[PDB]
From a paper:
Here we examined the factors that define the oligomeric state in a circular protein oligomer by studying the Bacillus [name] ([name]). Studies on B. subtilis have shown that when [name] is activated by bound tryptophan, it can recognize and bind specific segments of RNA. When the tryptophan concentration is high transcription attenuation occurs as [name], binding to the leader RNA region of the trpEDCFBA operon transcript, induces the formation of a transcription terminator hairpin thus preventing the establishment of an antiterminator structure. When the concentration of tryptophan is limiting, [name] is inactive, which allows transcription to proceed into the structural genes.
Unlike most other Bacillus species, the RNA leader region in the alkaliphilic bacterium [name] contains 19 NAG triplets, which could potentially interact with [name]. The oligomeric state of [name] [name] was unknown and we speculated that it might contain more than eleven subunits. In this report we show that [name] [name] forms 12-subunit assemblies, unlike the B. subtilis and B. stearothermophilus [name] that form 11-subunit oligomers. The main chain r.m.s. difference between residues 8–70 of B. stearothermophilus [name] 11-mer (wild type) and [name] [name] 12-mer is 0.48 Å, indicating that the 11-mer to 12-mer transition is not accompanied by significant conformational changes in the protein. The transition is achieved largely by the 2.7° rigid-body rotation of individual subunits around inter-subunit axes. The 2.7° rigid-body rotation of individual subunits is accompanied by much smaller positional adjustments in individual residues easily accommodated by the plasticity in the protein's structure. These adjustments serve to maintain the interface and its individual contacts while allowing the overall rotation of subunits with respect to each other. The 2.7° rotation of neighboring subunits with respect to each other is possible owing to a significant change in the conformation of the five C-terminal amino acids in [name] [name]. Comparison of the [name] [name] structure with the available structures of [name] 11-mers indicated that the C-terminal segment consisting of residues 71–75 plays a critical role in selecting between 11-mer and 12-mer [name].
Residue numbers in the entry:
A (entry chain A), B (entry chain C), C (entry chain B), D (entry chain A), E (entry chain C), F (entry chain B), ...: 7 to 76
């Protein structure tokens, strides 16, 4: 039931899915062009993700901007 | 059980369903003309979606506008 | 247990039910004339819907108006 | 447990029950005269309803008036 | 488990219980004189009700007055 | 687990229990004199009640007064 | 888990337990003198109670005074 | 799992446990001197309690003072 | 899963555990000197406690002070 | 799932774990020096704790200071 | 179902996964360059994580900044 | 499922995991340099932790600063 939203602020965003289990590798990379949105769950096969590029990210904890200086 | 809403702001918005499981591919593409709405769940077969085009997207985290510059 | 409400703002509204499973196709189209309302669930057979025409749409995320310039 | 309330604002309201399952047909039509109220659940046999005529409709998401211009 | 309240504002308010299942019929009629109250559940046998007459009706969505013109 | 409270405002109040199942009839009538209170559950045997007389009635939806001009 | 509290405002309060099941009879009467408090549950054997005399009564729905004029 | 708190305002406050089941009797009496506190649950053996004496009583409904005149 | 907290305001505080079941007796007494704190659960073996001495007592219903003139 | 936090305000704090079951004895003492923190659960083996020394204690019910005069 | 978010404030951030069970060791290290984000769950294999570098960290308890002088 | 956060305010903060079960011992020590963060659960093997050093600690009860004098 846990899910997250990624919106690409610019071209060049990638979302990597990381394998659930003893081993940790990237099993999929989804590219996002500017304006594209991926809505994705954690699943049997995906227990972590890594996001690269200029993006807005939403989870239960709020909205995160990758370009912002905190 | 988790579900999301997509309303097209222009013709040709495209909603791709991504397969649940070890493999990740687009198993379905649903196009939306301006003003059309898709309401869709995550399911046994669909564990992520990719959306392209000028659209309003709603999840339990709130409403996103794909056009908005952050 | 998730349900949605559609009210036709004008004649010509259609609600398509999309099949649950590996196969995705329309299994039903319900036509709504001005003012008519459909209240419908996601179900064993329906895991997504597509709505066409000038309509008010309600989900747990709130009320959408297809005609609104967003 | 999901239920809805319909109050007829005038004579000529009908509430159609739509069959749950692979097939979608109207299995019952209940007529409401002005002032009459139907309170009804979704059930094993009913997974969607269609409402016609001048009516006030209540669900979890609020109260809807079929005659109103949104 | 879902339940509703009906208070008669006049004599001869009538509460019809509608059968759960494939068939839909009135299996019981309970009449209420002015000020009398019925508190009733949905059950194995009752999946909808139809109410006629001047009455106050309460559900988890709030209080409805059958006389009020909207 | 749903329960209701009835307080008699005057002598002459009666609380009828209505049988659960295909058959609907009164299986019990409890008389309340002024000020007396009944607190009762819905149960295996009771799926609806009817209240007659001048009474204060409490459910999870709030407090009703049978004598009130609504 | 459903429970209620009775405090006697004066001598002469009685709390009657009513039998759960097909039959409805008083299986116990507990007398309360002024100031005494009974805290009691609904149970396998008790599905309703009747309270007589001058008392303060508390349930989930609030506090009720038997002597008050509503 | 439901529990209650009793603090004595005077010596000789008395807490009687009432048996769960078909029979209702006091199976235990616990006396409290001024300022002493009992925190007790309802249990397999105890489905009601009777309290006599000047005391503060707390339940999930709030705090009661047995001395207070209403 | 219910727990309680006792802080000794002065030397001489005692917390008695009362046995769960048909038999009710003290199975343990824990002595607390000034400032010492006990945090304890209800359990398979303990269904009530009695607290003696000058103490601050905390439950989900709030904080009590045994020395307070109520 | 029930847990508590202890922070030592000064050297000389001890946290005693009390055995769950028919018998009640201290099965472990953990010493805390000034500034050290113990976060601990209730468990199969621990159903109560006793805390000695100058400490800040946190539970669901709030923060308690052992040195404070209430 | 608990998850956490890590955003790298600068290059050089590392997220170590710590093994669940009797054995505790690092089974994975994910490196994050400036702006990159990891969203990850606790899992069958990971019961703790250690984060090194200049990072924004989000959990259900809120947002932490590793560089902040606390 | 319960989890906690520890951020080091100085080098050499030390987090000791304490064994679940009849025996209580430190089964693991994780040291943190200034700014490093551990996010950790209670588990089958870990039912308490002991933390030494200048640190910010977060639980569902709030944030604690080990340096703060109360
Ligand atoms: N294979 C790892 C992936 C992972 C999840 N959460 C992590 C946190 C840190 C490092 C790796 C992970 C797992 O399922 O446990
Ligand atoms: N429901 C899990 C993810 C998940 C789905 N199927 C699974 C099977 C095994 C392990 C985890 C999962 C979550 O929200 O976090
Ligand atoms: N209920 C899941 C989706 C889902 C439905 N059927 C499934 C079967 C297997 C795995 C996941 C699912 C969710 O809301 O996220
Ligand atoms: N087949 C993948 C699809 C997926 C879900 N969430 C993801 C996040 C990142 C990359 C891929 C995914 C899965 O079910 O796990
Ligand atoms: N047959 C698809 C229908 C579907 C649900 N959600 C979707 C999102 C995108 C595309 C298709 C879908 C399924 O049950 O999984
Ligand atoms: N409750 C499901 C829909 C549903 C009903 N019956 C089903 C049987 C199989 C799969 C899904 C369903 C949902 O909202 O997601
Ligand atoms: N027979 C369909 C009825 C239905 C429910 N929800 C729908 C949404 C759109 C179209 C039809 C429906 C079903 O049970 O799935
Ligand atoms: N409880 C379901 C409706 C329902 C009742 N019985 C059913 C049997 C099968 C499928 C659905 C149902 C709901 O609220 O939505
Ligand atoms: N509990 C259901 C009604 C109900 C009771 N018994 C049933 C048996 C079958 C189907 C429904 C029911 C509700 O609140 O809506
Ligand atoms: N026999 C129908 C009664 C019913 C319930 N909800 C309805 C809505 C519309 C029409 C009929 C109904 C059923 O149990 O499904
Ligand atoms: N015997 C009916 C009693 C009943 C409950 N709710 C009702 C509503 C209307 C009419 C009768 C009823 C039943 O158990 O279903
Ligand atoms: N808990 C049910 C009433 C009830 C108790 N026991 C029952 C046995 C069968 C049917 C209903 C019941 C309700 O409030 O709706
Ligand atoms: N023997 C009845 C007692 C009862 C409970 N609620 C009632 C309401 C009205 C009349 C009687 C009752 C029963 O268990 O069902
Ligand atoms: N737990 C029920 C009462 C109850 C206890 N044991 C029971 C056994 C049978 C029926 C009801 C009960 C309530 O709070 O309402
Ligand atoms: N858990 C019940 C009391 C209880 C405990 N054990 C029981 C065994 C039988 C009946 C009731 C009980 C309550 O909080 O009210
Ligand atoms: N033996 C009775 C005790 C009781 C509980 N609640 C009551 C209310 C009134 C009278 C007696 C009781 C029972 O378990 O049911
Ligand atoms: N042995 C009694 C102890 C008890 C619990 N709650 C009580 C209230 C009053 C008197 C005694 C008790 C029991 O388990 O039931
Ligand atoms: N969780 C129970 C106490 C308890 C723990 N283990 C038990 C075993 C039997 C009876 C009660 C218990 C309560 O708070 O009421
Ligand atoms: N061995 C006791 C310890 C205990 C828990 N709560 C208590 C309260 C008072 C006295 C002792 C205790 C038990 O598990 O029950
Ligand atoms: N989960 C219990 C403690 C506990 C863990 N394992 C247990 C085994 C038996 C009894 C109690 C426990 C609590 O939070 O209170
Ligand atoms: N292997 C340890 C890892 C761990 C989790 N939480 C901890 C807290 C402190 C030290 C180690 C840990 C465990 O699963 O229990
Ligand atoms: N849901 C667990 C993590 C988890 C997933 N699968 C597991 C299998 C075994 C143990 C733990 C897990 C938690 O957050 O604590
Ligand atoms: N879920 C427990 C910890 C836990 C995980 N696996 C366990 C196995 C046995 C006992 C406890 C556990 C908690 O949050 O506190
Ligand atoms: N081995 C102990 C560890 C522990 C948990 N909570 C405690 C509180 C005090 C002392 C020790 C502990 C246990 O699992 O129970």
């Amino acid at each position: 039931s846990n899910f997250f939203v990624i919106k690409a602020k610019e071209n060049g965003v990638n979302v990597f899915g990381m394998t659930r289990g003893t081993d940790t590798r990237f099993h999929h990379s989804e590219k996002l062009d500017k304006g594209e949105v991926m809505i994705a769950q954690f699943t049997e096969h995906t227990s972590a993700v890594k996001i690269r590029g200029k993006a807005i990210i939403q989870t239960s904890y709020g909205t995160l901007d990758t370009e912002k200086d905190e």
